[PDB]
Design a protein around this nucleic acid. Structure first.
Lengths: 145, 102, 118, 58, 49
RNA sequence: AAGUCAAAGCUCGUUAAUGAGUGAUGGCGUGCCUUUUGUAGAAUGAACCGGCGAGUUACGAUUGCAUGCGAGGUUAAGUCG
RNA sequence: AUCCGGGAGUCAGACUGCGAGUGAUAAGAUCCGUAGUCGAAAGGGAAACAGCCCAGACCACCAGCUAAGGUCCCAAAAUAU
RNA sequence: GUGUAGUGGUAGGAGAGCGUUCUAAGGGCGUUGAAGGUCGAUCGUGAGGACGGCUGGAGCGCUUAGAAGUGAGAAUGCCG
């Protein structure tokens, strides 16, 4: 034992940010977002305390898919029954249920335990153009990342 | 105050009136001790320094000579037939600090 | 000359047990399984005593990442400039400074910015 | 003249020629150094252990 | 030389070798004999020559 | 494979010393023995606790250590005890 | 390194560069020559992995430099020129 | 003192030690509580050793040497 800063539970203060997704490839937007959420960029990082922030994503319809993957990046599922493999979707979810897109392409790039789940419910993604959360005064981030 | 010191192979942050544990020193219980090397002088006017800020010392006295608790290291190899057994009590000399940089 | 086996064994076994207080079931009242558990615990203790020294470097590194990057200094170029301007702070102290004494950390970042600028 | 010789590798997995050339000079552990004169035989040993040892020409 | 202070001539009495008492002596589990083979049963070994 | 390293909180207060109990959460991690080129093996043995349970002795032979005499050493059977 | 003497285990090997045989210039095949490692070797890389690449743990520390391999996120480091 | 150097390892060879019962001499403890049992946050590099609290109620330590029915987790072991 010696002296190294170990964040407690409540001392950490979270903020609110608003990020656009207008003409950005899916990968990199998700990457920046996922890095912000886990609590990095805060020198008070602690690898078992949830020091994250709250992210709000706008215009989830105008997200960009480079080349093909408009009609080739085939998602999947399986219903745990014989012959249940339902590959239903494609890069069509941009149209419909556009929340589903980022809510997988990020719920992948996180850890896989409770911390990596309670660190996921801080996500709020809106295909539209304006959020209802003005009750909490979110700010804006930029992307040259 | 606020200062940084090289002892053993490590650094430490030092403040007036608080003790500090370090490695053995070859000095007796209750004599003065001076550390040569400083790397920073903090507080409210940071004196950053090229290695070993020139002309900065740290007094302080020694109060005890005592070892730690045992760190048993028994090794064994499975499917074969072997154990080695060990023991250890590392000695560390507690040091009370007074009169940071003069 | 018949040497009986009076109490040479219980000393040994009950010395093993006490070394296994609080194991998740019948691994604290079975003189056969307590021993195997103690053995594996010894292996793990040894290995991880060599990992306690690994992590804290990766941890201080991530913290220097977070704090430094805010000043436009990537976590490489900061260390590079520092080891170029002949400044030799130890990572642990750099992490501590980055967390607490923001003014001093920014002073160092300024000196480094000046350093590799040459 | 003289030569400074330093081990810069490991011998694990390299044959006796390399091992028994090294041992003959005084190279036991990594980054151990030995200073030797420059005959026309020492340079031969160095040419046979080039890849395992870097050398300054003092 | 008194009864309660006896000392033997130094280097004049060895100790013994009791074989098969635990893997630290170096002679447990096959009693310094190795693996199978009729040199390793009870009373193995062939006649002389 | 059920732990160890890291650790918030909660309750304590000892052979008095860098204290004890528990433990949210993170990192890492495929028992023990035997036989085998090779083991977590889906090769083979143990239900658990306790007790007993395996290189010894007599007579020869040989080499090292030591001790008493040394061109010498040395008794056996047997008698008194 | 040689010589004299006291005490043994070993005689079922495996894969991988290389050069040859039988095979069908097939086999994690079989049988030899030669080098390493495994057997008797833990730590890093190859997602996990005896035999591949790097390297041989007496012990302690919440210090520093590098090899193989790497530098968007899981996961430490360049969204480098 | 101080320098130099080395310290993975199965079959196996070598060396030094811990512990149990008994015998011999010397010196000791014990109803003002011995052996044995339980608990404790203690000591040595190891095997291991002390100290204190409770139970228990008649014999046991320590030093030097000697002799061994002297050390157990596995035998589809044997007895409860």
């Amino acid at each position: 034992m010696r002296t190294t800063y170990m964040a407690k539970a409540g001392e950490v203060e979270r903020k609110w940010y608003v990020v656009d997704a207008t003409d950005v490839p899916l990968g990199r937007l998700s990457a920046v977002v996922a890095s912000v959420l886990r609590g990095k960029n805060k020198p008070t990082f602690t690898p078992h305390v949830d020091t994250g922030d709250f992210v709000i994503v706008i215009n989830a319809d105008k997200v960009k898919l480079t080349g093909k993957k408009a009609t080739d990046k085939i998602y999947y599922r399986h219903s745990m029954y014989p012959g249940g493999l339902k590959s239903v979707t494609a890069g069509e979810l941009r149209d419909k249920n556009s929340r589903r897109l980022i809510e997988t392409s990020v719920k992948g790039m996180l850890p896989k335990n409770t911390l990596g789940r309670k660190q996921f419910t801080k996500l709020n993604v809106y295909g539209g153009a304006e959020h209802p959360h003005a009750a909490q005064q979110p700010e804006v981030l930029d992307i040259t990342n | 105050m606020y200062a940084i010191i090289k002892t053993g192979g490590k650094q430490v942050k030092v403040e007036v009136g608080q003790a500090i544990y370090v490695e053995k020193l070859n000095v007796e219980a209750g004599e003065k001790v001076v550390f040569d090397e400083v790397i920073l002088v903090g507080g409210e006017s940071t004196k950053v320094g090229a290695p070993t800020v020139a002309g900065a010392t740290v007094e302080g006295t020694v109060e005890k000579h005592g070892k730690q608790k045992k760190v048993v290291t028994f090794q064994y190899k499975p499917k074969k037939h072997s154990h080695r057994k060990q023991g250890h009590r590392q000695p560390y000399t507690k040091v009370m600090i007074e009169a940071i940089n003069a | 000359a018949r040497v009986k086996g009076g109490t040479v064994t219980r000393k040994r076994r009950k010395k093993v047990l006490k070394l296994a207080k609080g194991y998740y079931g019948s691994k604290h009242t079975l003189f056969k399984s307590a021993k195997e558990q103690v053995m594996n615990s010894y292996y793990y203790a040894f290995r991880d005593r060599r990992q306690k020294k690994r992590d804290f470097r990766k941890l201080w590194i991530a913290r220097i990442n977070a704090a430094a990057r805010m000043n436009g200094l990537s976590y490489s170029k900061l260390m590079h400039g520092l080891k170029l301007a002949e400044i030799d702070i130890n990572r642990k102290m750099l992490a501590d400074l980055a967390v607490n004494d923001a003014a001093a950390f920014t002073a160092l970042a300024e000196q480094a910015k000046d350093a590799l600028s040459k | 003249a003289e030569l400074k010789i330093t081990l810069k590798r490991s011998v694990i997995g390299r044959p006796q020629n390399q091992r028994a050339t090294v041992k003959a000079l005084g190279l036991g552990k990594v980054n151990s150094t030995v200073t030797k004169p420059a005959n026309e035989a020492i340079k031969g040993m160095v040419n046979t252990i080039s890849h395992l040892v870097d050398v300054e020409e003092v | 030389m008194k009864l309660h202070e006896l000392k033997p001539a130094e280097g004049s009495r060895q100790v013994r070798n009791r074989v098969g008492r635990g893997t630290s002596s170096g002679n447990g589990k096959t009693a310094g004999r190795g693996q199978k083979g009729q040199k390793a049963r009870s009373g193995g070994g062939v006649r002389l020559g």
